[PDB]
Amino acid sequence: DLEMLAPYIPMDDDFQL
Amino acid sequence: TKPLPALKLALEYIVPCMNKHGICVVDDFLGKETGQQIGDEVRALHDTGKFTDGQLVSQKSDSSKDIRGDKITWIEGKEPGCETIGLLMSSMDDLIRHCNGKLGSYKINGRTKAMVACYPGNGTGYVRHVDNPNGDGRCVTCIYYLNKDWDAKVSGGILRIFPEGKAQFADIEPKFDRLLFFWSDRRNPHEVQPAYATRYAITVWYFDADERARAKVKYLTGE
Amino acid sequence: XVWLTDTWVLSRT
Ligand SMILES: O=C(O)CNC(=O)C(=O)O
Ligand SMILES: [Mn+2]
């Protein structure tokens, strides 16, 4: 239900701080 | 004119504010000159047809435009003609660094690319939702608005947050040079009310290291 | 420069 509404993001190549 | 240093802004405002309310607004974050440069870069990206329809985590709707009506692009920050967006992202990262693990118990080690989003009026918005409903790693949402002299009574476009444990909802106008932080999880359901003018914003999501680690799993079995 | 802590808006300048 809630997952169907959430904004998509890439699941890879996160920027590291 | 005389902006608070980032270290003081973070330790004496952002941290106590986020821990008390779970929402934090900083107006006049970078100043008019830098903010206008950012507006120029966003308008250049938009004018070149580079934006795509906003997508959902799990595609379960007939059309994605039923839920969110924005068009977006993902900016790494080093692209040509995106230098001021990279400066915005590094400033956001500097604030998060200054917070030194004092945002709840989160250990923030990474973030997403920048999502440059445009709601092109015509009543487009984003229905009420939670950014990270089921532990995909996002702990803090960080949004920078770009809309000078935005009059919600005429253009709509208000970000309404519904924080858990609060009597009232919180209306955020998408003002030029405004920075917004809020917890990405179920404590902050939120919606973009229909916009009737072109509304621009730049979002970044910061990751909690442990939850984000658990989100990235490959099943070499069938499951 | 002053923050009413029941609010969540602050001008950096
Ligand atoms: O642009 C805004 O005010 C907020 N947008 C969102 O809630 C989103 O893209 O997930
Ligand atoms: Mn959202």
Author numbering:
A (entry chain S): 558 to 574
B (entry chain A): 185 to 407
C (entry chain B): 1 to 13
Question: How is this structure described in the published paper?
Answer:
Following screening for cyclic peptides (CPs) binding to PHD2 via a modified mRNA display methodology, we identified a 14-mer cyclic peptide thioether (3C) that promotes crystallization of the catalytic domain of PHD2, whilst still enabling a catalytically productive substrate binding mode. Pleasingly, we also discovered that 3C enables rapid crystallization of cPHD2 in the presence of 2OG (or NOG) and the substrate, HIF-1α CODD (aa 556–574), in the P21212 form. Although binding of 3C induces structural changes in cPHD2 C-terminal residues (400–404) that form part of the C-terminal helix (α4), 3C binding allows protein–protein interactions between the cPHD2 C-terminus and the HIF-α substrate, consistent with the catalytic activity observed in the presence of 3C. Binding of 3C at the interface of two symmetry related PHD2 monomers likely promotes contacts productive for crystallization in part via projecting part of the C-terminal helix α4 (aa 400–404) away from the active site, in a manner that maintains interactions with substrates that are required for catalysis.
The degradation of HIFα subunits is promoted by post-translational hydroxylation of prolyl-residues located in its N/C-terminal oxygen dependent degradation domains (NODD and CODD). These dioxygen-sensitive reactions are catalysed by 2-oxoglutarate (2OG) and Fe(II) dependent prolyl hydroxylases (PHD 1–3 in humans). The human PHDs catalyse hydroxylation of prolyl-residues within the N/C terminal ODDs of HIF-1/2/3α and are negative regulators of the transcriptionally regulated hypoxic response.
